[PDB]
Amino acid sequence: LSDLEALRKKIEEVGMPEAVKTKALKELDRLERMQQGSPEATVARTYLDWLTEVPWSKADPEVLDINHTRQVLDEDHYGLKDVKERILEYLAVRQLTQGLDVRNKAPILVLVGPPGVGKTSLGRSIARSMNRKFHRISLGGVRDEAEIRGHRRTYIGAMPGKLIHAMKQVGVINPVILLDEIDKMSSDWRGDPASAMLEVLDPEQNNTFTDHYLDVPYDLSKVFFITTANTLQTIPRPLLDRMEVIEIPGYTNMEKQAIARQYLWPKQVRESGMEGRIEVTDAAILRVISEYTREAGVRGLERELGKIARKGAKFWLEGAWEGLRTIDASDIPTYLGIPRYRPDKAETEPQVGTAQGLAWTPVGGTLLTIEVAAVPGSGKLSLTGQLGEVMKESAQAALTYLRAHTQDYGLPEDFYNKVDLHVHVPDGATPKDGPSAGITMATAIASALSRRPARMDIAMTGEVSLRGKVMPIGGVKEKLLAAHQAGIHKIVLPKDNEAQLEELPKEVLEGLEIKLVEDVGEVLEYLLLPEP
Amino acid sequence: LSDLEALRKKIEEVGMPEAVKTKALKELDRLERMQQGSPEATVARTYLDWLTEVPWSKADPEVLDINHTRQVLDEDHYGLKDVKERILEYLAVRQLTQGLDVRNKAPILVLVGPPGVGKTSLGRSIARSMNRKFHRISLGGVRDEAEIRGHRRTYIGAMPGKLIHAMKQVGVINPVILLDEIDKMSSDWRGDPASAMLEVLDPEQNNTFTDHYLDVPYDLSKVFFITTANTLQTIPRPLLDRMEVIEIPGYTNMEKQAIARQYLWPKQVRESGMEGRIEVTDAAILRVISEYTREAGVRGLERELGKIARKGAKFWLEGAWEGLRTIDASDIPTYLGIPRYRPDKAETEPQVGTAQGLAWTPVGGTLLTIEVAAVPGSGKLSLTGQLGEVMKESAQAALTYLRAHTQDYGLPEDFYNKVDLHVHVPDGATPKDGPSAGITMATAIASALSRRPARMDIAMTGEVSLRGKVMPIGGVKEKLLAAHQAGIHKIVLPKDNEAQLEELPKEVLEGLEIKLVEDVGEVLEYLLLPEP
Amino acid sequence: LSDLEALRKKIEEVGMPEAVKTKALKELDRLERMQQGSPEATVARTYLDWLTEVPWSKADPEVLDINHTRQVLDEDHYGLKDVKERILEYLAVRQLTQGLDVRNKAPILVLVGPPGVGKTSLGRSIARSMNRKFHRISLGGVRDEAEIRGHRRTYIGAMPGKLIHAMKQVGVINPVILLDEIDKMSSDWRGDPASAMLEVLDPEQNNTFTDHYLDVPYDLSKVFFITTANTLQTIPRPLLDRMEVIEIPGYTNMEKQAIARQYLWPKQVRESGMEGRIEVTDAAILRVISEYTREAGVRGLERELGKIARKGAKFWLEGAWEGLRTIDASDIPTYLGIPRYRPDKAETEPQVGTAQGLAWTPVGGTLLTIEVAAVPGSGKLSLTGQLGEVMKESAQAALTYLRAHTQDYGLPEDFYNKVDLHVHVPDGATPKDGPSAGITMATAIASALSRRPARMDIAMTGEVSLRGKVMPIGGVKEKLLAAHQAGIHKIVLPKDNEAQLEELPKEVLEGLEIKLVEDVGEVLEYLLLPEP
């Protein structure tokens, strides 16, 4: 009928590519009948529509400027001023894609950092700065080669791929596609679509990208892929090549104060119609940072300023008081809730077995408390709390040091066959391949067996090797940031990471009093309430 | 057909968008030729009936005041005194930007709670306060876009979606659609019921939301949508963003007695025509609350009072002799029968191996009676009833504290290799997850091994760590509503939550008698009824 | 000839509505020719043959009274004592709030039961009491709204809906219309027939009930509908509300003998053409009930007694010898051929590995038998035959209870590490596969391990908790009705259910014998013939 007229004109109201035109005229050969009824025309309808709605070889304009790009990139969340150099170096790699116009065997810009620190804002800034468009696909919980690839074109209700879905939305084949959480792909049911994303993510394979709900492979050559991920090593290992590690580290408190006064809170006030009626003094911004969110990103702070703006809308719709209200740090909890975090956690009044430890998580940096119970028995060892064997052998190494140092620290003649040990660590292994918490467990076990109070407010990290030698670790900047944002002021380190301390800004170093030591007896000296 | 002339008029009198004018006049130019129509006359005639009846350009007034909505939301069900403030905050934000400033990217008030606590009534109360026509749409068991969208325009058959019907009924273009039960909606059959919800969610896209029984995208810009879920867990994740969460939990008992004197027992005595002739004392309302239903909310209390009303109609229609009945707590069972439940918990005879945790299932809170058997055997452990390793960590932590302190509870000196344990959790699938039953299982295990009875009548909750400390648990208010409904009168919460404890409205802290602890030795001096 | 004359006279003589008079004019327009055949006008004469017969305001004088309806419902079956009370409450409410149509939207009487019991006899008794005119319509299995609503007079098959046939055969506007098997109505076709009966249910849209054959939609204002199902869990959920569960169970033996003596067999005699020639005492009716059919209702008694009476007529054909041919249970397989069912299910060989639980299918009650094979091996459990997690967990709980008490039951003092158990259930596909066979499996496992006889002729239901207890189970009346169908005389019930044992009729308790327990100790002292 006229629906057949529409789906028949769409064969030549969209000028198709050659093999696509061939299978389209075969779709019309199955057509020229009722548009509904039998199910073989309905699967023909979804097949025709999904193949004649995805756009065919059309693109946006493109810029080769760095100056206007620099202008826009200096206004995302305060401008990071260091990693934008790295992004300008990658866009200088775009300044050499000449012979074969892809430049793979070459980076693709994975963006690594805690969730929401401007990564998506960097994507939006690049999208505005190249006059492109933007779209997101989140790969969270992907294990299926019909989510990414096609599904069997023999059913009504089979699925086109997510990638072809998102390309069906955007009308060109140069969007900026944001692949969010590329690390959380899996392989449980119907193959591993990591190889599918690889075939998306090559020089000369995307331009004939294989589909199976689309029975011709579809051209995806010119899409500016941009990719973000929390971890660094849970990424598919052959796909870990052809990349550029853009580290976006976490912020500090003063930078988030600047972001609040300049970028966040003006949008929060304009998103509740209170232009010119509410203002916040900056000690209250310090209050919101230092008592109401403990993270590395700036998403929760945006929620808090949103709550304050919405309450201001209510209190001004119930009687117009003044031209300018001022909200100091006194009456934040009139507008917000209870103070959910104390600014001084130094009122913990040190524990007995607990070791305060630093940690490298996929969401960046955090603290931990390693929790050790020394119970009577016959001598064993157990570690719980979803740990891996790497933490277990690090504890093995710690005990191997401990067995040769009995009477020097307040321990029995032995504990390898008298005292059972149960160790909880609140998270498991590190995504970096290594237990970065050797001396943490060592101070915990020595504190619990010695029955001597381990001091809190002394965060620490560092390994204990099989020789008991304290080893240099990686990613030190983020654990130092995590110790900074909780207000912790003492760090125990291996000495050999001090070159790592060359890449640390000043205000972080003003509070972190570093004890660059080299052996396990030295943290036992500098930590416990006894001098040993 | 002069009715066909009327069809042409009712097309050509209501002011349409001119694309609808185009397609409707084309349907008139391809009708009036199949007068004996096999469905070509029929489907086109029903199509033009839909293009006449569906509301195009239909005006309806509005509030501009937060204050009249205060005046009206004191007259539905109660005041409820927390959620009234959140509703007015959302409307205060909506008022100061109405007039279409560019900040129309707003969330849409999901109302999470148990079934039947005043959600649809709250929609009706808001819709009275705005003078817009309320209407509901249920989404319980929606799986395919033939239900959200149209499916077949070809022959008369598959209808348009739910939305065009529920706009056709309401004579104006701006209802208050209540989309109930948005979490039970799932992709059951082959089809996507989530992305259509994301399209009706977003205020940029649904300016021209479309279906398939019609061929102009409909103008849904002015519908104040509002949804309703019972569980925040299983909501699709692209929908859980852009979603204002307002949490309505259940009522305490004295609020149930007050709602039943105000709004429920008079409408029930209206509903069975026996006004001014049946009388219910407040002890009777309290008896029917406490001894005949346990659900959170007031569904069951409606059905109970309906039964008393209809029985009164029967007893008066087999003889009229009075001026007025008078029920009290004496003759409830004469109208209802044997009590489904029992009186208060204070007579429930202390078991030797049982603990009464608190929980919040999404159909209302509950007690849990976790029961633990101490089987004389090897020394290993066993867990049944829908448990992962979270409960094994809790059991092992509490058991480690006991292995430290066998002297402190009359235990034998050695039972890691004497006694097996068999733990049975009665509801292992409480979806508000976590080890929030730490001293629950610690009390059960120390009761089962010490042969000394754990008391009933005292609820408790918390977490445990290997040193033997009680950490805080989140969600104090839902735990106290469960402990206040199910009949308990003594609660043991962790010490770390007393700053949370004054957050409550002071209804909830009336009957309850909180014993705040911080270590497991305190709850095992409370709950163990004899000395050891 | 003058068929046009008589029809124009009739259409003016039959009282039309005025809009119906206008559509009668537009049907009249195509007339005035005196030739037959007439493929347009044959449809017209048949349409007016329908339209001169549908009732327009003919009334039957309804009596209100709730005492006449009871003095007529005492001439239905032997006595139901519960559903007659519920029908008196419902019709009492419809006696007060009638005419006072401020209150409306009444529910519509779902009558739930096994097929066979007096559904339509309760319908006809109500219709005798109100002096209305009963007429059924069976709406089980219908998948098409073109059958329930009208049908198009544009291709041949120009018929009204079923409901206009039911209104043609009733010459008034206030009948009692019954809708048998409203849940067997399927929905796999063009037109969901649930929405049609939602419209017929509707007390507002009934006034313009749409037909695709009649032009003006019809009114269903006073038609007192009433519905029937078999289980209320397959009705669609909008239609499930605005129902009233009046739940009819099956009968015991004395009730079926009384129904056959009082009511059935005089009908089946005097419908045969025979009268006063046969004598049947209690023995033959006892035999025909117990050893010839396996149903809940009374279809089988009706059919078999009618076949007996017809073959008694056949024997009377070859001689009118005597007016008294006394029949009893001895000589009855003369008339019915071979008896089908065994005489004794009570004497069922009190052996070891057998357990005899009470259950119920939704065509009538049943007895589950449960086997346990106690083989040597490693110690692990096997469940085949529709055995999920709850039955296995109840088995595991019973096994733990045995491990607590190995001394006084003749067990091996360590058996859990030595004996494998194949627990087989033939019938888990029969409903309620959850825990109601707790002491069933406790007796099965205790006998199959202790190699002591588990008794026939004692039945049991309930649950077991882990410390060793018996919980209560709901729905006591259906279970004891099943136990009095299938021929047992001893029942084990929990202590906790004892209160519900005074909601039953007193007849059920004297044919049976209820052995209440509270623990597993009492049921293990009951059911072992030798105990050690």
Residue numbers in the entry:
A (entry chain A), B (entry chain B), C (entry chain C): 243 to 774
Quote the authors verbatim.
The Lon protease is a AAA+ protein found in prokaryotes, archaea, and eukaryotic organelles. Lon is involved in cellular protein homeostasis by degrading damaged or misfolded abnormal proteins, which prevents these unwanted protein species from forming toxic aggregates. Lon is known to form a homohexamer; each protomer is composed of multiple domains, including an N-terminal substrate-binding globular domain (NGD), a long-helix domain (LH), a three-helix bundle (3H), a AAA+ ATPase module, and a protease domain. We show here, using cryo-electron microscopy (cryo-EM), that the activation process of the Lon AAA+ protease may involve a pentameric assembly and a substrate-dependent incorporation of the sixth protomer to form the substrate-pore-loop contacts seen in the translocating state.
To provide a comparative context, we also examined wild-type MtaLon in two states: without any nucleotide (MtaLon-Apo) and incubated with 5 mM ADP (MtaLon:ADP). Additionally, our cryo-EM structures of a series of spiral subcomplex oligomers of Lon determined by 3D reconstructions suggest a sequential pathway for the construction of the THT. In the proposed pathway, the THT is formed by sequential incorporation of the protomers, beginning with Ob1 and progressing in the clockwise direction through Ob5, and completed by the incorporation of Ac6*, whose binding mode is dependent on the substrate.
